Design a protein around this ligand. Structure first.
Ligand SMILES: Nc1ncnc2c1ncn2[C@@H]1O[C@H](COP(=O)(O)OP(=O)(O)O)[C@@H](O)[C@H]1O
Lengths: 421, 232
C-alpha cells in the first residue's frame, strides 16, 4: 500500500530547545506560519501574539554537551524584539532576503500586512524598527492570511491568499502595487510558486489545483483525484510544486471538519506529448495526527539536492520525510530510528506542543560533536517553532551515498539602500 | 550474578500508615506454581536485598506502583519480570505487559530473562517492538508481553494500531537515567504512559537518580512507593 523504508543513513539530531516566547494560556488554533529564515545573511524571524523577534541564527543553535539534560529548555538567547501592536499570524521573507512580511489581525481594524526592510533591523541608529509600507485588506474576519508566498526568483513579487477565498499578487518595491487579484468566488485555499517562479499554482475549495501566470491568466487545471467520492468531497489544504510535472498536494474534508485527517498525495502529471492520466499516490497521514483542535496545515518543503520532501503538520508532533526513489520517479516514506526523529516536546503541563513555523538553516558552520572523539561536518538545521513558544532545532544528517554538502556561508547585511517609511 | 551491598534499602511507602515490607523467601510471595518453578529453574534461592522490599509492594493485593533505585546487579530486572509474569494471562492472546528499554540490545537481554523465567507458562510469547522488526500494517500483535524501545513502542500503540494500550496491566521503564539521556525517549515514554488505563501498574527503575530523573519519574508513576538503596 503506502511505500515505506527503514532509513539508517538519515538522522535528525536534536540541539538544545530554546524558549522564544512565553507559554500561552490556551492552545493556538488558527492556521499560522511564524518562522522565517534568511539564509543569505543568517537571521531567523520569529513572531507571535506578543511581538516580532529577530536572531542571528547561530545564537539559536546550541549543541548538547555530554552530561547535559537534552530535555532542558534554554530560557532566552539574545535577539531583538520589535514591538507589534497586534498579533502576527504569518511571517515570510522575499527571495533577496530584504523584505519581511508580517501579517496581523486587529479585532478593530481587521488585517494588515506590514513590510519591513530587513536592513532596518540592522540599523543601530533606528531605536524603533518600523515597517516601510503597509497593505490593508479591507476585510476583517475573512481577511486572515492563510497562505502567503514570495516568488523564488522575482524578489519584489509575493502571492497572498485570504480566508474569504480571494487571492492577490503583489509587487513590493519602495511601495506596494497590486498586480493581480482574483475575487473570493474563485475559492482559493492555498498557493505555491513554480520552482523557477514563472507560474503560480493555487489550491482550491473544489479539490482542484489551477495553474496561473503571475497575471492570473489560467494555464492548466489538475483535477481532483479520482479516488475521492462525491459524498466525501475535499479541498486542497496545501500544495507544493516540486518539478514542472510534480506536486505534493494535501487534501482535507471540504466542509472544514478537523476530525477527518488530511491526505498527503504525490501527483505526477502527463505532458503535452502524453495522453496518460495523472498519477496520484496517497501517502495519507505521514505526520501522525494527535490533535483535532487546530486548523489543519501541512508545512511542506523540497530539498532538491537530497531529492526529498520534509513534512510537518499542525495536528502532529512529528516531522516526516518523503524521498524520491533510486527509481527517480516514485516516492517512499523514510522510517527512522527512535532516537533519530524530529518531534516536538511535551509541555511541562504534559500536553503536546505542535508546530507554528518551520524553516531550515544552511548557514550553520559548527561541526557536529558526536562522541568525545568523533566529529561530523556541519549539517543543515531544521527548526520548528512550537505552540508553547519553544524553538526546536535538529541537525539533518543525510549519510546517503553521493549527497553533496548543502552548507552555505552567510554574508554581512549592508544598510545601503534601506527603504524608509 | 548478584552485586554485594552492606547498605540498607530506604523505603517511602505510598501509604504512610500501612507497613508491609520485607519478604525473605519467594515461597512467601504466593506466586503461581509455574512462576515459582521458573524462579527455581533459574537457581534463585532468596530474594535479593532490593527484591525483599520491592516484591511485596509490586505483588501486593492489589499491586502497587514503584519507583526503585539500585545499582547494577541488585536484581531489578528479575524483580520486574516477576511483576509482569505474575499479571500475565497467556490464555489471552494480546499484549498485557509493556516494558520499555533504552536500547535494542537491552530489549533483547531483558527478553531472554522474561523467556527463561516464563519457561513454564504454556504459550507465553513475546513481541519485540524495536528497530527492524518486520511487521506489516494491518496486523495486531497476539503476543502477551511486548518489550522494546520507546519510539517503536509508541508507534505500535498509536500510528500503527498494533497494540491496544487500554489493555495493558503492567508498564515497566527500565533504566530511567539512560532513557532520559537519549534523544526522544522521555517524551515518547510520557506519550505511551498517558494512554494506559488508570488501573495499570506502573514501575520505574534507575541506577542513578538526579532531579531530572526524579521529576520524570513523578510524571510517569503516579502514587508511588519509592525505594532507594545507596550504592556500594
Ligand atoms: N534473587 C536472586 N538470586 C540469585 N540471583 C539473582 C537474584 N536476582 C537476580 N539474580 C541474578 O543476578 C544478576 C543480576 O540480576 P538483575 O535483575 O539483572 O540485576 P539488575 O537488573 O539490577 O542489573 C542476574 O544474573 C540475575 O539472574
Amino acid at each position: 500500500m503506502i511505500p515505506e523504508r527503514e532509513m539508517k543513513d538519515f538522522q535528525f539530531r536534536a540541539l538544545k530547545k530554546v524558549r522564544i516566547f512565553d507559554s500561552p494560556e490556551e492552545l493556538p488554533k488558527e492556521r499560522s506560519s511564524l518562522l522565517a529564515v534568511s539564509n543569505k545573511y543568517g537571521l531567523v524571524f520569529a513572531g507571535g501574539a506578543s511581538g516580532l523577534q529577530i536572531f542571528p541564527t547561530k545564537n539559536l543553535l546550541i549543541q548538547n554537551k555530554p552530561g547535559d539534560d537534552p530535555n532542558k529548555i534554554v530560557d532566552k538567547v539574545q535577539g531583538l524584539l520589535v514591538p507589534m501592536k497586534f498579533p502576527i499570524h504569518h511571517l515570510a521573507l522575499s527571495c533577496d532576503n530584504l523584505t519581511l512580511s508580517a501579517c496581523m489581525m486587529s479585532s478593530e481594524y481587521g488585517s494588515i500586512i506590514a513590510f519591513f526592510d530587513v536592513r532596518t533591523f540592522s540599523n543601530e541608529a533606528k531605536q524603533q524598527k518600523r515597517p516601510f509600507a503597509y497593505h490593508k485588506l479591507l476585510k476583517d474576519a475573512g481577511g486572515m492570511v492563510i497562505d502567503m508566498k514570495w516568488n523564488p526568483t522575482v524578489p519584489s513579487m509575493v502571492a497572498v491568499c485570504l480566508a474569504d477565498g480571494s487571492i492577490a499578487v503583489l509587487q513590493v518595491t519602495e511601495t506596494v502595487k497590486v498586480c493581480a487579484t482574483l475575487p473570493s468566488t474563485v475559492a482559493v485555499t492555498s498557493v505555491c510558486w513554480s520552482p523557477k517562479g514563472k507560474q503560480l499554482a493555487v489550491g482550491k475549495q473544489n479539490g482542484t489545483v489551477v495553474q496561473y501566470l503571475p497575471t492570473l491568466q489560467e494555464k492548466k487545471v489538475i483535477p481532483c483525484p479520482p479516488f475521492y467520492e462525491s459524498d466525501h468531497p475535499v479541498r486542497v489544504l496545501d500544495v507544493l510544486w516540486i518539478g514542472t510535472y510534480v506536486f505534493a498536494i494535501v487534501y482535507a474534508a471540504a466542509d472544514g471538519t478537523l476530525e477527518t485527517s488530511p491526505d498527503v498525495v504525490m501527483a505526477l502529471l502527463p505532458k503535452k506529448e502524453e495522453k496518460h492520466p495523472e498519477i496520484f499516490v496517497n501517502f495519507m497521514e505521514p505526520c501522525y495526527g494527535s490533535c483535532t483542535e487546530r486548523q489543519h496545515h501541512y508545512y511542506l518543503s523540497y530539498i532538491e539536492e537530497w531529492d526529498l520532501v520534509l513534512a510537518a503538520s499542525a495536528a502532529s508532533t512529528e516531522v516526516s520525510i518523503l524521498a524520491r526513489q533510486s527509481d527517480q520517479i516514485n516516492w517512499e516514506s523514510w522510517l527512522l530510528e527512535d532516537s533519530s526523529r524530529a518531534e516536538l516536546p511535551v509541555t511541562d503541563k504534559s500536553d503536546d506542543s505542535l508546530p507554528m513555523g518551520v524553516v531550515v538553516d544552511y548557514t550553520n558552520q559548527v561541526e557536529i560533536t558526536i562522541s568525545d572523539e568523533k566529529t561530523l561536518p556541519p549539517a543543515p538545521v531544521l527548526m520548528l517553532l512550537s505552540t508553547d513558544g519553544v524553538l526546536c532545532p535538529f541537525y539533518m544528517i543525510n549519510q546517503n551515498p553521493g549527497v553533496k554538502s548543502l552548507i552555505k556561508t552567510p554574508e554581512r547585511l549592508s544598510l545601503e539602500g534601506e527603504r524608509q517609511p | 550474578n548478584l552485586v554485594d551491598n552492606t547498605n540498607q534499602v530506604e523505603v517511602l511507602q505510598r501509604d504512610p500508615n500501612s507497613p508491609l515490607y520485607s519478604v525473605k523467601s519467594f515461597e512467601e510471595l504466593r506466586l503461581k506454581p509455574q512462576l515459582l518453578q521458573g524462579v527455581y529453574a533459574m537457581g534463585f534461592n532468596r530474594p535479593s536485598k532490593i527484591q525483599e522490599n520491592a516484591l511485596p509492594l509490586m505483588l501486593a493485593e492489589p499491586p502497587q506502583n514503584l519507583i526503585a533505585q539500585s545499582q547494577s546487579g541488585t536484581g531489578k530486572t528479575a524483580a520486574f519480570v516477576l511483576a509482569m509474569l505474575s499479571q500475565v494471562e497467556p490464555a489471552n492472546k494480546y499484549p498485557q505487559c509493556l516494558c520499555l528499554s533504552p536500547t535494542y540490545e537491552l530489549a533483547l537481554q531483558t527478553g531472554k530473562v522474561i523467556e527463561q523465567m516464563g519457561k513454564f507458562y504454556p504459550e507465553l510469547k513475546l513481541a519485540y517492538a524495536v528497530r527492524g522488526n518486520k511487521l506489516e500494517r494491518g496486523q495486531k500483535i497476539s503476543e502477551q508481553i511486548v518489550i522494546g524501545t520507546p519510539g517503536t513502542v509508541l508507534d505500535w500503540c498509536s500510528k500503527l494500531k498494533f497494540i491496544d494500550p487500554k489493555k495493558i496491566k503492567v508498564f515497566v521503564l527500565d533504566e530511567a537515567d539512560v532513557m532520559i539521556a537519549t534523544q526522544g525517549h522521555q517524551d515518547q515514554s510520557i506519550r505511551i504512559q498517558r494512554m494506559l488505563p488508570r488501573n495499570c501498574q506502573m514501575l520505574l527503575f534507575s541506577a542513578t537518580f538526579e532531579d531530572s530523573v526524579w521529576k520524570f519519574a513523578q510524571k510517569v508513576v503516579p502514587d508511588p512507593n519509592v525505594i532507594k538503596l545507596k550504592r556500594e
